[PDB]
């Protein structure tokens, strides 16, 4: 991921790191994850890089994914099922879809999905 211009997500860059790692944790948990569209725009490259490591599959890839997602077990699933599931796709692991804007802020919502 190149950085983002403009104000980083959540609060500052640290909260953006935490947001991204949380969104990727729950993405590699459920596969289908709804956020607001700018969160998904920030997370799509980030998650696709993590899954690149997943389909690499070695202790260095595990140790460089655990440097983002603290959780040992969602990453067990990453380097167990989600990883090999992309035995073919070179790039293009996630997919954004448009949901209707959240009432209360009209925040453009989007559901990001592991391709399958």
């Amino acid at each position: 991921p190149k950085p983002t211009k403009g104000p980083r997500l959540g609060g500052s860059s640290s909260h953006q790191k935490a947001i991204l790692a949380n969104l990727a944790t729950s993405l590699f948990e459920h596969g289908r994850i709804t956020t607001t569209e700018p969160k998904a725009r920030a997370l799509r490259p980030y998650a696709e890089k993590l899954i690149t490591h997943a389909k690499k599959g070695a202790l260095h890839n595990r140790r460089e994914v655990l440097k983002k997602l603290r959780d040992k077990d969602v990453v067990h699933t990453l380097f167990a099922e989600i990883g090999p599931f992309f035995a073919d796709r070179d790039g293009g692991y996630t997919r954004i879809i448009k949901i209707e804007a959240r009432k209360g802020d009209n925040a453009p919502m989007a559901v990001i999905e592991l391709v399958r």
């Binding site: 879809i97 448009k98 949901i99 209707e100 559901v111």
Partner: protein, 53 residues
């Protein structure tokens, strides 16, 4: 600073009228049921299903 004078209802109304609202709809979209006119933005989650209504 304050309004030095009140606004002639001409100007008042003339830019209460520049307080518009946007639009787009993509009519005739077959989904489960009778064709709903979801907007061109969302029609992928209209097709797939990830849209309320």
């Amino acid at each position: 600073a304050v309004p030095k004078r009140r606004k002639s209802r001409s100007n008042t109304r003339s830019r209460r009228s520049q307080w518009k609202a946007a639009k787009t709809e993509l009519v005739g979209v077959t989904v489960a049921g009778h064709a709903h006119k979801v907007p061109r933005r969302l029609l992928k989650a209209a097709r797939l299903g990830l849209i309320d209504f």
